[PDB]
Structure 1
Amino acid sequence: QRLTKYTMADLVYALRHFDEGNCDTLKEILVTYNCCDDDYFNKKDWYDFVENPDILRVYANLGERVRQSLLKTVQFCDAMRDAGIVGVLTLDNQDLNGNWYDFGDFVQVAPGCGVPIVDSYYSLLMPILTLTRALAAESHMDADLAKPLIKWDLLKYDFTEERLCLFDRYFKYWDQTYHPNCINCLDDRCILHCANFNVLFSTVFPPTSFGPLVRKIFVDGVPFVVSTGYHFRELGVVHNQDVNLHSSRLSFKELLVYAADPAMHAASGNLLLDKRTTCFSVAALTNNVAFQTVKPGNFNKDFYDFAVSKGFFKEGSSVELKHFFFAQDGNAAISDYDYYRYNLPTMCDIRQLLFVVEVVDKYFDCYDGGCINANQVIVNNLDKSAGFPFNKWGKARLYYDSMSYEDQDALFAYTKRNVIPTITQMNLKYAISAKNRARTVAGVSICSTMTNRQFHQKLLKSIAATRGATVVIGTSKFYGGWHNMLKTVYSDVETPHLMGWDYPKCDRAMPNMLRIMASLVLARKHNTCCNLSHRFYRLANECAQVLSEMVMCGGSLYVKPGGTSSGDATTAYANSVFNICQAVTANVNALLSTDGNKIADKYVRNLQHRLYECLYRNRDVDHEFVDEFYAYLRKHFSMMILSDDAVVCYNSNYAAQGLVASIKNFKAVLYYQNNVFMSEAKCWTETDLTKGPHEFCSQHTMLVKQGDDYVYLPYPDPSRILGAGCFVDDIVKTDGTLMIERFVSLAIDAYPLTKHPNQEYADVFHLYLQYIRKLHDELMLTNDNTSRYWEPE
């Protein structure tokens, strides 16, 4: 009696199955409990997290209400245990004031012997505990928002007892072992389990207690400050083992470890207060702040004028000059860093994450892998920056040509027993775009990339050499490759439709939990060449090096909250592990969220039933169920995946019934998984497979006649090809050889445009060939050299 209108189930559903048109449940709850007024919903895009970030301040007003429900649940659970009651706790039996009712599934067995079943109860709540800042009260002295903040000791770095205290106060009846320090976990499943709790618990500890942990050590009697461990928001405290004090001299390897270690740079730097950003920072390494600009593109007037004389760039034409190198201002680099403000602590539904990851693993169950030695590592890009401070001396060649293979293996072995918290450097990029936004690259250091290849390269090379699988990296579009990739995804789908989607702010909002999941999946090949402790330290290093590393910008060191790094060895692959995880999650939710009794097909009805019962029960992995669910997705939701870019050929007859994910499922999943709103305006749907995917690998697809048969060809946007022709990166002004090579490559990409019905698109190819013949005569390319590129050999 005297219950609220809505239940915890409605709040969780409204937040996890979010849809801007049908958001009345959420809007009413937010107004009812004074999170915001009604006028709040008249703000353009009030529900987004990227625009109008204010929504986080609004959801946070539910945080006290959410912790009150968690606390009442624990009190309820104690009462039913003492009463001898056995039963299941659900969200629709608890109202929004946290009161429990309607205990129909509860039975009595014996006084003092009851037990709550809370696996779906807490797992369903978990994603909204970080969204609504449920533990914000715990930052206050009495766990009371009306009182002062805890005067935490700056030198405290462990917080093991504090995490256990939170665990046993809010999740007291979560009957699964929690290990605050993930170093103590038995397998990878136990790391995601524990890390998910650490994400929530770590938000009430001060920001200065996280990151590298340091000690004073001596060499030849001279003191140094070095890292001897690291405190991870997700993994807890990891200590180093190979810590040697009172050494006499340092080895080359020790110099690399210390030079890369911010303990030497930050502890010795200036204190920095940077008001241009909302991100946490540690130290300035200078006395003078550096600013960085980007110059305009180098205009190739001869190409442009040549094209104008052929009818290009005329008013009213369908092909415009849209792609340019835009100049940047002084405070660009920092405004780029500041987009890391969108990476929010995100807790996952662990019962679902631990299922989805098994399905994700099935998708990579055809690739080879394992650890290779230093003399088995292939590095072609040796002109790549070695990162800060290594880049003050040279490029990767300098370190690869200095260290013996035995030393490269020794550095690798070090990272299997310790953690090296490296520094990467961010820089502005001079590149062609249709937009004036800043673009950057990540100068990931040599002390990371040199050992990441030994751990991951065998797998990355196996993935890149495999054709016909779902994750397609390194597969050429040429010689029928585009066509073969499309036939591979189309497969035997019964009623095929094509879909794609967008990942709003991916390289910045991707949470550390999914970044850990992806590195754990890629590390699953290390079974016959890596023990458990070694697999943990390698995870700790990947996390210290690319999720929570120190990033130099300008003249100072900033801390990265999360996201991806464009300079790392695995990003192109880790992003595909992620894309599959989100797509699988959307399909798991698409099926579980529908009405199981409205399904005409008994098979699917039984699949939905068993799917629920393989997530919130039956914790042990049911490999037969996973194989079955996986096979279902392969048949009705066929994916072709590249780093943050996917095409899905799906059975629309099932998607129509909610048995297969659709774009609305991706929108909901992204909203709570990456804290971003995905506009439908950036997502395409195509019903006619005569035409290919609207866009994949930034290219359009059309079916054309070739060989008295038909093939699919990719094609570029003509405005990018002409823009690329017209503006250069200032390196072809001295050597016509380079000018010809870039024009020939553009001419090849433009080739398929001659098959296009729009003559103005076809003309771009012909323009390029006449220009190239002119360049070859001045220094030959013919239409046969470009035609052979799409003819299978």
Structure 2
Amino acid sequence: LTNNVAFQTVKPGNFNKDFYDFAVSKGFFKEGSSVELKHFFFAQDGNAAISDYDYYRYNLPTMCDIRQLLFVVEVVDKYFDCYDGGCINANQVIVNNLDKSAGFPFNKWGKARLYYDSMSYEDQDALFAYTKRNVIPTITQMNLKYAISAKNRARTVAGVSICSTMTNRQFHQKLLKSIAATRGATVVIGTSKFYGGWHNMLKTVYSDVENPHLMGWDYPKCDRAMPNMLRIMASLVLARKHTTCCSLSHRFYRLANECAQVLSEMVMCGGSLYVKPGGTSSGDATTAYANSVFNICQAVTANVNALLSTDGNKIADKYVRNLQHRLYECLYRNRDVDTDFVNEFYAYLRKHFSMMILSDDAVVCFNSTYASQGLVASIKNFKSVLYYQNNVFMSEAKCWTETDLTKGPHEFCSQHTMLVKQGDDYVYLPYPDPSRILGAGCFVDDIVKTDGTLMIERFVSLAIDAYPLTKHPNQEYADVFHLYLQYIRKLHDELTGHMLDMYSVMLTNDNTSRYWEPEFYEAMYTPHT
């Protein structure tokens, strides 16, 4: 588009010398300490956005087992059954952070606020109905992510145009809000980890598993290697709720808009257009939920492959053997949906392979004695399914397995789980990697966050995220939260001191003495919202 290529770099993080000095004053970052800085704002050179966009080379044209995929779709739809969705009018659309960028070229003139203010509800409704019988290809701007991470690889997020995002909101937001309003479901998007929500999630995962083990896996290059068939399946499953609001032509044209906007659109990496081969444009209005249905599809495919790639003569249980027989029947013999067996297999999966699904992050409480017998995907069925249906090799070193349920999932949503005894009962608290919180305190992305006095609530939120470290058996982990409390106290005391130097008096009524106290943060993880 321009006469010269635009090389976008990623700046290094802005140091927080005050917080780092306070931490080392409290005996942190000692030579050999179990807690060390591992998360940093890794900088990137000019040819980094295009280098990360080239990771779409891992997106290959993948032909799926169609007779198997058509059954996995039914099982995933059974997973997405308790929710409700459909078209909503422009007046019923909820948009958080209207001051976010609006793709290309709409970012030249303003944020999404301009295009949600310049378009009346009738204008947005006309645009959304236009996509029900037309296709609007859109330009997706590839933006370098400027955030703290433990990996030096450049992170990129897809900036989808306001034309695509606005219509995808009106098409999917009802279902998405229903998904992020349901508790005790397989997809835990919208379920808070605070106020006992993490414990509720984990207890729902341990629903009725007879021989429970915890198993989480990893999708390598998930947003880059997801086959276009699986992304289309995700969009169709999300479109399964439009039985009444949309005609078949309307649903197909909405799917075509999805594919032309977030699957094979024109990417604007740098200052020039490119063709996206496929995969998840992980900036679309359904990124988390499409990744969730993709994850459920991969898990169901792994379970189906485990059942079918099992010696049925050696399957001692007469129910599981018949289930495998009818599974083969419904895959390659039955042509129409066998809703009876779809429900039966969905119930079998819920009983023996209960899942906790977010956007490509998952924890499964699976029947260990079944996965040992190949009646449920243990980890190798996941590896094989990724190999032949995702064009990646799932390394088993990126896949944990916890055989004891008293200690929860090894890692879910980058949060570890430990069973703490708050009140009089035992609950599971999500504690993060202490290096992550320490780096967030020490490395910040604006210079104004280099003095905490400016944003004390930032460290309040970090201590909220770091409170469950207090119960950790390792003292340095608890020392992280204690250090954050002491630093919050120091910040408040220096803010009051600076204000006193600017006045002839000081603030008398504070009520801020709860920020450097464990009571304010303990209530954040107790089941009383």
TM-score normalised by structure 1 residue count: 0.62
- Are the counterparts in 1 of residues 489 and 515 from structure 2 also a CA contact under 8 Å? no
Q: What's 1:784 paired with?
A: 510
Q: Could you say if the C-alpha distance between residues 456 and 380 of structure 1 is closer, same or farther in structure 2, counting changes exceeding 3 Å?
A: same
* Other structure's SS at 1:320 match: coil
Q: Could you say if the C-alpha distance between residues 432 and 475 of structure 1 is closer, same or farther in structure 2, counting changes exceeding 3 Å?
A: same
1:763 shift after superposition: 0.4
- Are the counterparts in 2 of residues 480 and 791 from structure 1 also a CA contact under 8 Å? no
Query: Could you give the per-residue CA deviations for residues 305-360 of structure 1, whole angstroms, max 9, x where no partner exists?
Result: 11111111111111101111111111111111111111100001110001111011
- Are the counterparts in 1 of residues 16 and 451 from structure 2 also a CA contact under 8 Å? no
Q: Could you say if the C-alpha distance between residues 337 and 322 of structure 1 is closer, same or farther in structure 2, counting changes exceeding 3 Å?
A: same
Instruction: Choose the corresponding residue for 2:63, options 337, 347, 352.
Output: 347
- Are the counterparts in 2 of residues 346 and 673 from structure 1 also a CA contact under 8 Å? yes
Q: Could you say if the C-alpha distance between residues 457 and 783 of structure 1 is closer, same or farther in structure 2, counting changes exceeding 3 Å?
A: farther
Q: What is the RMSD computed on CA atoms of the aligned residues?
A: 2.7
Instruction: Write the distance in 2 (CA, Å) between the matches of 1:782 and 1:671.
Output: 65
Q: Could you say if the C-alpha distance between residues 550 and 529 of structure 1 is closer, same or farther in structure 2, counting changes exceeding 3 Å?
A: same
Identity of counterpart residues, as a percentage? Answer: 98
Q: Could you say if the C-alpha distance between residues 765 and 785 of structure 1 is closer, same or farther in structure 2, counting changes exceeding 3 Å?
A: farther
Instruction: Write the distance in 2 (CA, Å) between the matches of 1:783 and 1:295.
Output: 41
1:654 shift after superposition: 1.3
- Are the counterparts in 1 of residues 470 and 478 from structure 2 also a CA contact under 8 Å? yes
Query: Could you give the per-residue CA deviations for residues 557-609 of structure 1, whole angstroms, max 9, x where no partner exists?
Result: 01100011222110100011111111111111101111111111111111111
Query: Could you give the per-residue CA deviations for residues 753-786 of structure 1, whole angstroms, max 9, x where no partner exists?
Result: 1101111111000000011011112299999999
Instruction: Write the distance in 2 (CA, Å) between the matches of 1:731 and 1:529.
Output: 49
Instruction: Choose the corresponding residue for 1:511, options 220, 227, 236.
Output: 227
Instruction: Choose the corresponding residue for 1:530, options 241, 246, 249.
Output: 246
Instruction: Write the distance in 2 (CA, Å) between the matches of 1:770 and 1:752.
Output: 16
Q: Could you say if the C-alpha distance between residues 589 and 316 of structure 1 is closer, same or farther in structure 2, counting changes exceeding 3 Å?
A: same
1:733 shift after superposition: 4.6
Q: What's 1:224 paired with?
A: none
Structure 1 residue runs of 5 or longer lacking an equivalent are 1-284
Instruction: Write the distance in 2 (CA, Å) between the matches of 1:385 and 1:630.
Output: 40
Instruction: Write the distance in 2 (CA, Å) between the matches of 1:785 and 1:374.
Output: 43
Q: Could you say if the C-alpha distance between residues 787 and 761 of structure 1 is closer, same or farther in structure 2, counting changes exceeding 3 Å?
A: farther
Q: Could you say if the C-alpha distance between residues 738 and 636 of structure 1 is closer, same or farther in structure 2, counting changes exceeding 3 Å?
A: farther
Instruction: Write the distance in 1 (CA, Å) between the matches of 2:516 and 2:202.
Output: 14
Instruction: Choose the corresponding residue for 1:302, options 11, 15, 18.
Output: 18
Instruction: Write the distance in 2 (CA, Å) between the matches of 1:530 and 1:603.
Output: 40
- Are the counterparts in 1 of residues 17 and 450 from structure 2 also a CA contact under 8 Å? no
Q: Could you say if the C-alpha distance between residues 780 and 304 of structure 1 is closer, same or farther in structure 2, counting changes exceeding 3 Å?
A: farther
Q: Could you say if the C-alpha distance between residues 623 and 407 of structure 1 is closer, same or farther in structure 2, counting changes exceeding 3 Å?
A: same
* Other structure's SS at 1:524 match: coil
Higher relative contact order (CA 8 A, sep 6+): 2
* Other structure's SS at 1:324 match: coil
Structure 2 residue 467 is the aligned partner of structure 1 residue 751: yes
- Are the counterparts in 2 of residues 547 and 560 from structure 1 also a CA contact under 8 Å? yes
Structure 2 residue 136 is the aligned partner of structure 1 residue 410: no
Query: Could you give the per-residue CA deviations for residues 160-186 of structure 1, whole angstroms, max 9, x where no partner exists?
Result: xxxxxxxxxxxxxxxxxxxxxxxxxxx
Q: Could you say if the C-alpha distance between residues 764 and 377 of structure 1 is closer, same or farther in structure 2, counting changes exceeding 3 Å?
A: same
Q: Could you say if the C-alpha distance between residues 574 and 777 of structure 1 is closer, same or farther in structure 2, counting changes exceeding 3 Å?
A: same
* Other structure's SS at 1:737 match: coil
Query: Could you give the per-residue CA deviations for residues 241-285 of structure 1, whole angstroms, max 9, x where no partner exists?
Result: xxxxxxxxxxxxxxxxxxxxxxxxxxxxxxxxxxxxxxxxxxxx1
Q: Which stretch has the larger CA shift, 358-367 or 771-780?
A: 771-780
* Other structure's SS at 1:790 match: coil
* Other structure's SS at 2:419 match: strand
* Other structure's SS at 1:553 match: coil
- Are the counterparts in 1 of residues 303 and 377 from structure 2 also a CA contact under 8 Å? yes
Q: Could you say if the C-alpha distance between residues 572 and 758 of structure 1 is closer, same or farther in structure 2, counting changes exceeding 3 Å?
A: same
Query: Could you give the per-residue CA deviations for residues 23-63 of structure 1, whole angstroms, max 9, x where no partner exists?
Result: xxxxxxxxxxxxxxxxxxxxxxxxxxxxxxxxxxxxxxxxx
Q: Could you say if the C-alpha distance between residues 534 and 467 of structure 1 is closer, same or farther in structure 2, counting changes exceeding 3 Å?
A: same
Q: Could you say if the C-alpha distance between residues 450 and 337 of structure 1 is closer, same or farther in structure 2, counting changes exceeding 3 Å?
A: same
- Are the counterparts in 2 of residues 480 and 790 from structure 1 also a CA contact under 8 Å? no
Instruction: Write the distance in 1 (CA, Å) between the matches of 2:379 and 2:5.
Output: 46
1:738 shift after superposition: 5.1
Instruction: Write the distance in 2 (CA, Å) between the matches of 1:785 and 1:481.
Output: 28
Q: Could you say if the C-alpha distance between residues 521 and 783 of structure 1 is closer, same or farther in structure 2, counting changes exceeding 3 Å?
A: farther
Instruction: Write the distance in 2 (CA, Å) between the matches of 1:791 and 1:600.
Output: 57
- Are the counterparts in 2 of residues 479 and 790 from structure 1 also a CA contact under 8 Å? no
Q: Could you say if the C-alpha distance between residues 780 and 600 of structure 1 is closer, same or farther in structure 2, counting changes exceeding 3 Å?
A: farther
- Are the counterparts in 2 of residues 411 and 451 from structure 1 also a CA contact under 8 Å? yes
* Other structure's SS at 1:332 match: helix
* Other structure's SS at 1:587 match: helix
1:295 shift after superposition: 1.2
Q: What's 1:500 paired with?
A: 216
Instruction: Write the distance in 2 (CA, Å) between the matches of 1:523 and 1:543.
Output: 13
Q: Could you say if the C-alpha distance between residues 453 and 788 of structure 1 is closer, same or farther in structure 2, counting changes exceeding 3 Å?
A: farther
Q: Could you say if the C-alpha distance between residues 372 and 567 of structure 1 is closer, same or farther in structure 2, counting changes exceeding 3 Å?
A: same
- Are the counterparts in 1 of residues 486 and 516 from structure 2 also a CA contact under 8 Å? no
Instruction: Write the distance in 2 (CA, Å) between the matches of 1:681 and 1:780.
Output: 56
Q: Could you say if the C-alpha distance between residues 327 and 785 of structure 1 is closer, same or farther in structure 2, counting changes exceeding 3 Å?
A: farther
1:739 shift after superposition: 2.1
- Are the counterparts in 1 of residues 485 and 517 from structure 2 also a CA contact under 8 Å? no
Instruction: Write the distance in 1 (CA, Å) between the matches of 2:148 and 2:512.
Output: 24
Instruction: Write the distance in 2 (CA, Å) between the matches of 1:737 and 1:413.
Output: 50
1:787 shift after superposition: 14
Instruction: Write the distance in 1 (CA, Å) between the matches of 2:517 and 2:72.
Output: 40
- Are the counterparts in 2 of residues 715 and 750 from structure 1 also a CA contact under 8 Å? yes
- Are the counterparts in 2 of residues 370 and 529 from structure 1 also a CA contact under 8 Å? yes
Instruction: Write the distance in 2 (CA, Å) between the matches of 1:525 and 1:299.
Output: 48
1:734 shift after superposition: 8.7
Q: Could you say if the C-alpha distance between residues 608 and 738 of structure 1 is closer, same or farther in structure 2, counting changes exceeding 3 Å?
A: farther
- Are the counterparts in 2 of residues 478 and 789 from structure 1 also a CA contact under 8 Å? no
Give 1 or 2 for the bigger CA radius of gyration: 1
Q: Could you say if the C-alpha distance between residues 366 and 580 of structure 1 is closer, same or farther in structure 2, counting changes exceeding 3 Å?
A: same
- Are the counterparts in 1 of residues 485 and 515 from structure 2 also a CA contact under 8 Å? no
Q: Could you say if the C-alpha distance between residues 484 and 532 of structure 1 is closer, same or farther in structure 2, counting changes exceeding 3 Å?
A: same
Query: Could you give the per-residue CA deviations for residues 435-456 of structure 1, whole angstroms, max 9, x where no partner exists?
Result: 2111112111100011111000
- Are the counterparts in 2 of residues 367 and 462 from structure 1 also a CA contact under 8 Å? yes
Instruction: Write the distance in 1 (CA, Å) between the matches of 2:209 and 2:111.
Output: 49
* Other structure's SS at 2:510 match: helix
Query: Could you give the per-residue CA deviations for residues 496-554 of structure 1, whole angstroms, max 9, x where no partner exists?
Result: 11111110111100010000000000001111111111111101101000111001122
- Are the counterparts in 1 of residues 14 and 450 from structure 2 also a CA contact under 8 Å? no
* Other structure's SS at 1:639 match: strand
Q: Could you say if the C-alpha distance between residues 573 and 738 of structure 1 is closer, same or farther in structure 2, counting changes exceeding 3 Å?
A: farther
- Are the counterparts in 2 of residues 773 and 781 from structure 1 also a CA contact under 8 Å? no
- Aligned pair count? 508
1:732 shift after superposition: 2.6
Q: Could you say if the C-alpha distance between residues 610 and 784 of structure 1 is closer, same or farther in structure 2, counting changes exceeding 3 Å?
A: farther
